[PDB]
Structure formats: C-alpha cells, structure tokens
Write a protein that binds this ligand. Sequence first.
Ligand code: HEM
Length: 184
Amino acid sequence: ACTKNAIAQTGFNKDKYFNGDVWYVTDYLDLEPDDVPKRYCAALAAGTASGKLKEALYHYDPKTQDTFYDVSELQVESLGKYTANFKKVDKNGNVKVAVTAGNYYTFTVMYADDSSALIHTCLHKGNKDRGDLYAVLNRNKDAAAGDKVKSAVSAATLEFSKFISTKENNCAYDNDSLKSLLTK
Ligand code: HEM
C-alpha cells in the first residue's frame, strides 16, 4: 500500500508542466520491494485538451517487451496534486480497457522546472495495487539528472543513490503517439 503524502512544489506552475510536451522518466524509486521490474522504461505527456487536464502514459519492459499506453483525465485535489482515472489504449487511442472505479493513480509534482521534475505516484488497480513510486523526469530522453532536481530529491528526504536509472536500457519512445493521445 502507499504510505506517503507527497508535498507539491511551492509555486508549482501548472501551465508549464501541462504544456502538451513529453516527459521521460530517467530514474525511479519504488518504496515497496519487487513492486516493479529493475529494468523498465516509461514516459508521459501532460497537457490540457479542450479544457480538461490530461495525461498520456507509455510503459515498456525492455526485456519482456510488454508495452502499453494509457490516457487519463486528471481531477484536481490541490495545486500540483491530481487523481487520474486511466483507460488502457493502443498507441492510436483505441480503447482496450475502459475507465473503471478503483482504477486510478494519484500524481504529485514535488519539483518542476523547464527541463526536469520530481513526481510521486500511487497506483490503485483492482487487486494489483502499487506502493509509492517516485520518478525523476526530464524533457530530454536519458538526460543525466541536474543539480536542481537532485537537490529536490534531497529536500524530500530521499537518497538519490537509491533511485534506479532507466537510461541504460535500450528504450525507444513514440513521442508523436504520446502527444496525440492527449486528445483521446
Ligand atoms: C520507470 C517508472 C515506472 C515503472 C517501473 C512502472 C511500472 C509499472 C508496471 C510494471 C506496471 C504493470 C502493472 C500491471 O501489470 O498491471 C505499471 C502499470 C501502471 N503504471 Fe507504471 N511504472 C512507472 C511509472 C509510472 C508513472 C510515472 C505513472 C503515472 C504517471 C504510472 C502509472 C501506471 C498506470 C496507470 C498503470 C496501469 C495501466 C493499465 O493497467 O492500464 N507508472 N507500471
């Protein structure tokens, strides 16, 4: 189960974060052991589509090849803290698993700037929940974490040395699909 109430960035700039562009996960920290594979790749696009806050997600296991996309409308809990009801889609936005109650994740932006971010997420999915997950994001694929986001990791009382890098997996990303999905 999840255990953390992540605190959102003071002065979080929502329009900058939710600008329709792509964020790549470069490093992640799962608090629960064996909650996720040790080799993984993920990215998301976050934007507003016809007035609604939206995220599109991409997950790829670089070993098993398991791949899936999701689209969510976000509801606001407070500035920088959201609840997202996801539907699983193909890369084109065709629905594979409909939105359903109990299938949701929370999403807190703990730090963000032009190029980087630190987020916390808590996934709830039927009988397949996920414990707390933190992720370092960058606008550039596989970019090394800069001093600002690393300092934010420290300020959150987390040890960056514990984060797992995604940069050494052979991962490729369909940016174009992620952007398109925002409207789906
Ligand atoms: C590298 C970082 C991440 C890893 C290693 C990871 C790992 C996983 C894994 C292994 C699953 C499979 C669950 C299953 O088999 O049903 C999953 C599902 C999911 N994750 Fe992640 N995840 C990451 C980042 C994220 C982020 C940043 C978000 C939200 C912004 C997110 C949201 C979700 C959602 C919504 C599902 C269920 C999708 C569906 O069933 O349609 N994940 N994740």
